[PDB]
Amino acid sequence: MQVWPGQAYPLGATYDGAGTNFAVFSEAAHRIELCLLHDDGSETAVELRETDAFVRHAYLPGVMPGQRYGFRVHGPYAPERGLRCNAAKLLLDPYARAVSGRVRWGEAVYGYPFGRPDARNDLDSAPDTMTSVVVNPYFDWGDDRRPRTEYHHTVIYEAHVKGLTMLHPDLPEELRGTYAGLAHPSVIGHLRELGVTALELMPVHQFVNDHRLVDAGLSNYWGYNTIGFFAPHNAYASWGDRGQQVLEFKSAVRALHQAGIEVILDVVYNHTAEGNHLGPTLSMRGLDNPSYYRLADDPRYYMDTTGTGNSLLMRSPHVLQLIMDSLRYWVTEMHVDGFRFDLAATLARQFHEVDRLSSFFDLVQQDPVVSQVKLIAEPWDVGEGGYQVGNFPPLWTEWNGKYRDCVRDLWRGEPRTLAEFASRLTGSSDLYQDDGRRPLASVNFVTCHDGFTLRDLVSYNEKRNEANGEGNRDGENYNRSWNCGEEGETEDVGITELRARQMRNFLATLMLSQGVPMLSHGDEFGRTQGGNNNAYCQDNEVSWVRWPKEAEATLLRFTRSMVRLRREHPVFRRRRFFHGRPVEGTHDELTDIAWFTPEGEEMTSRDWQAAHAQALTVFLNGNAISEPGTQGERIADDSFLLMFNASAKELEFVVPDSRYWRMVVDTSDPEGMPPQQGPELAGGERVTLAPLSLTVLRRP
Amino acid sequence: MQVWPGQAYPLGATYDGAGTNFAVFSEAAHRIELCLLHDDGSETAVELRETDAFVRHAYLPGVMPGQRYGFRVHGPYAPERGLRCNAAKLLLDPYARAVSGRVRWGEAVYGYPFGRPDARNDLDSAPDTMTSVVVNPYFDWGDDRRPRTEYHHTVIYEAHVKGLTMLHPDLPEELRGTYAGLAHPSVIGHLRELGVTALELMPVHQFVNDHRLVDAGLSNYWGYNTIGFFAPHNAYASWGDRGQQVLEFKSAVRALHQAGIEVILDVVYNHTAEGNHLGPTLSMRGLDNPSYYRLADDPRYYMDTTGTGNSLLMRSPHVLQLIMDSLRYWVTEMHVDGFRFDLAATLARQFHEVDRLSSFFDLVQQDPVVSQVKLIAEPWDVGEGGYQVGNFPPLWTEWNGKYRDCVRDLWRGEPRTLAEFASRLTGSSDLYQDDGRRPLASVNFVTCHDGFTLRDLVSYNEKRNEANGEGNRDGENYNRSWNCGEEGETEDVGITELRARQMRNFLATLMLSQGVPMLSHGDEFGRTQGGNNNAYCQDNEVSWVRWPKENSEAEATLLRFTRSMVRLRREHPVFRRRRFFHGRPVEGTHDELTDIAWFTPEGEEMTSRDWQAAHAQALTVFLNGNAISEPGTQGERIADDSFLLMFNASAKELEFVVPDGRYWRMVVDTSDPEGMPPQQGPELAGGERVTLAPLSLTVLRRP
């Protein structure tokens, strides 16, 4: 009942101690109403009249947080002109700092009558839809020391916010599956014992349960399909949904930085949950359709290049703004350490149909907030020629798809070249050069959420995604996976211990390779998705995490004692990866590395093209480490000796240099042998090595 | 020494409490040395070897602010390829946040042998160049009440740092013409008394006195030839040049802001002081010539659209970073509240012939520091289509040149269309909207450092820039002015009062015209340059401000006239409408209730054909003080007394009639020689005639 004009910046819900400033963009709306929602379901419509930059805005004192607010836009309803505004639907603030409730699917949330897509729907959208919230922006990050952990000291961990803690019998069933159950000391401590420096969560941006999904008993579980990029997802909030979740995720980040674990929340900006036409009408299509979504040359239909349904307009400057304003809000206000752009390949494509691609990596590389955080993405190829960009921000990294496809295609049985294999342990120096013209790292992974899990990775040759309901045609088809003898679990102990060390190999490869190793959550305990490699709608025992009570425990203390080895020996984590100098080393008795035959000699000019690159002996030196440290200190370390047997028949290797070596790891024995103490070796002496197995020696 | 790795961000020299972290962008250098200079000219070479994204960087612990550094770059000298590197010229860090010294012009700083322009010079440019200096960024902004005065309240004052406080008999000799002298209670007194709400600083980024001037008896007094966009110009500091100039500036904005006065600084971006080839190799030519300047068609030579030499390759990835990092270092480290873009017209012609132009007005649009501050610049006509940008930063303003050329043409006696002058008072609705598709303001000005001064505008018909040594072919050719009887200083009293009464017309028109006003340093006293209208090279008595003594009768009257026109504006809203006349018409609905209404000398409402008056000499604008349909800071109806503007640009007496039964109290008359805004006023009847001397104004007031 008291309306001041207020300010045009910042857009959204911003509370000035005893007032609130509301701002909403639209360049094609007629009139905007801000409907202050009451608990009894009544609308207190305040027309917003001050116009600046096509943003209507007004300030209401005495309107304190928890206040539920929406928008109503009267605009032209012409699907011929891309004008799909509607006054009946109560729109959502794209800068909603928090959102209450869930989508209750009905006729009302659709904005066209089910019979006619070009007709106008005039149902009230108000009770069924969600509801944006005025977030109290105060928070006490007490000693919030920003963990500036380096890339060459990082161990990422891909974990889901609900699927992680739903079954830990240590957390109250109150906090099970929730953001606070993330910052529980026992869980914050399970990573500390692993030795991970980077927690990369899945989308915490608030997402919508697909209509055609919940009406199938399922629910979007991963949720790369969002509506509001300024709010924690509310079904992960055990502290309620009336703005309290923002104090949740914030209380969970500070506790992570307490134990010095970074947060890397996942980010989708390649489509919106409103989907193509015939979808719902919730936030964007209603406020201003033709300058949030890229429309075809028939304004009635949205160009989905993938299956998503719609794509944002990456040339309309107000859309560029929601992205940089979205990224900045988390880094600064929720104190997040890096991002990862889902379908950054579909993302980086979209720009290049508006010339605006290489002008965006300029925006990234100039801004001080977003540049100096980790940006993790995936390689692409656009138009004709490739990336077609000049300057990659010098933290911008890719998930190495040609390393896992190279590792998976090693213990499987098929060949990768010894050249393909040399450059992969090396840290993919051939695809990611540190120049400042290419991504500067490789996020090595043997597995992630897409495709199998490490357990399923050696247990199936075809998927078993009939549980997704998509006719089994979905999901990665050629997982490059070998099942070790039979499909499904079988009792046969002969093969059941075969797999148990196949994962002891998949994990060891990841840790000794140069670069950034990433673990998917559950591959320490041996997590199984029932052969399902795309579990996006399995919000159940499929992608829950079973917590152990020996087999599942041997691998946990395998991983946890392996990660010790990575953190402890600097030849496996070289600040400048082998970007400069060759993979063989300039052959002499000083090089950082030199490759050997199981027979004993060095590889040679026409030896590097070994199609059956099954066996290898890689010697890394502990004194050729040509990098200064934190303070100009020469980082030094022992020399190590790797011996790979990606070949069934037992192989006999020979340790060169005549020097007392110590076997520090052996895949083949069942008790797990990072921790189990080992014997000394002489060097030169013939050793036998089990099939499909690794061994590593140590000497200063 | 002792060499640690360091980082690559932030570019430039940054003091760490115990160290200094250097970084320099050069994507074509082959190896970069850092040179720590002592006082006894000793260069300690430290080979920066770490290379992330073509930034060579190292961390030097124990290096302290005040320690002099520079860069030396080993790259190929092939101008047929465009590379003009030379290991022998002690470069400067483009990010250096305080610079010491001065160009000591000789053969050594130019980077080529004075016989051939295409060959290679090997002269040590270390004792003849400036030297970058590490700076301590700590400062105590106790309560920096950033005076975020809105555009309708803004009274902008264009001063020059030296040219404001050089001849003041209140400042000690120490602080005359400096930054700390800018912080004096005296000048801040005269800035408040006048009522300025934002002081505009002529170029403050360190600039290079052109060799063409230093071997000419002259020097670059303005400073539109800059080198390091991050440093206070050293020659303005009375405390020291090894870094300390940052500590003046901050304590200076500090003292200004406490008074409620913004700081809008002028920035020189269209060109760099190394200029075109045959120019001194100072900062960027040697580091990386390709990715700073706009070379084209032939590598050796620089696309010259700027007309002042080198342009700056607006698509280069680290040229966008240098500009944006330089804009906001002044807003969030020096606490500046706004900017002014010299030669924004040309800069937009450099930004668009790379097709990065639109990409920039989006880059300013999102950025929270550069967007939300006052952005002042020039109109332009780019390539094909004029503006050719979509949506402006909705704080973007222009220097309303079609205002001054329209009011100069008026009190000189030329027939600017009765519509061309309607919209100019009105808030310049026609050229400046508020959607976001055009600049959301109409910054007005009668005169400035470009062109005449206000006592010169009324005394000379042609420029007199002979003292510039450019043969008087430089300067605005027709300044649309008139000398008022005898060109120069006359003894004729009939002339001498005509001027100081024309000057009252020019100042008063300005202070009632909608939009955002602006004055230049000297007009409150009426400073004369001697008809010199481009005094860029007069660092002498020509453009210092003379301060009026106490027994200086006439000059003190203009000052007391000016100090109360700002009063009349800061005290009555009707002369500054939050949304200027931007939706409404320049006439209003011709009925009982309109914010505005235009009448005749003879006393009738002007007709639509009467809106086509070539000889548009006489006028009477009514503003309704109750028809202000704009909300308050809290939603109040802002209501006022009604005003009555009467103009006569004629040359004989014209009798006006007061259009409005009720009564009017005359509050401003220009023909009065005592000065009316600081005087009393008779009562006009409400229909009675008034005799109005030629070239004179009258404002009446009534609640």
Numbering used by the authors:
A (entry chain E): 1 to 549, 553 to 661, 664 to 705
B (entry chain A): 1 to 660, 663 to 705
Quoted passage from the original study:
On the other hand, glycogen degradation requires the glycogen debranching enzyme (GDE; GlgX), which directly catalyzes the hydrolysis of α-(1→6)-linked glucose residues and the glycogen phosphorylase (GP; GlgP) to generate glucose-1-phosphate, which feeds into primary metabolism. In this study, we identify the GDE of S. venezuelae, GlgX, as a target of c-di-GMP thus uncovering a direct link between c-di-GMP and glycogen metabolism in this bacterium. GlgX is a 79 kDa protein that contains a putative carbohydrate-binding module (CBM_48; PF02922) and alpha amylase, catalytic domain (PF00128).
We first obtained a crystal structure of the apo GlgX enzyme to 3.5 Å resolution (Methods section). The structure was refined to Rwork/Rfree values of 21.1%/27.6% and consists of three main domains, an N-terminal β-sandwich region (residues 1–145) comprised of eight β-strands and several short helices, a Central domain (residues 146–575) that harbors a α/β barrel fold similar to that found in many α-amylase enzyme structures and which consists of eight β-strands surrounded by eight α-helices. Finally, the C-terminal domain (residues 576–706) contains three β-sheets assembled from eight β-strands. Strikingly, in the structure, a c-di-GMP monomer is bound at each end of an antiparallel GlgX dimer. Note, a similar dimer was observed in the crystal packing of the apo GlgX. This results in concomitant conformational changes in residues 377–396 and residues 341–355. Importantly, residues 377–396 and 341–355 contain the key catalytic residues, Glu378 and Asp342. Hence, the conformational changes lead to a restructuring of the active site pocket.
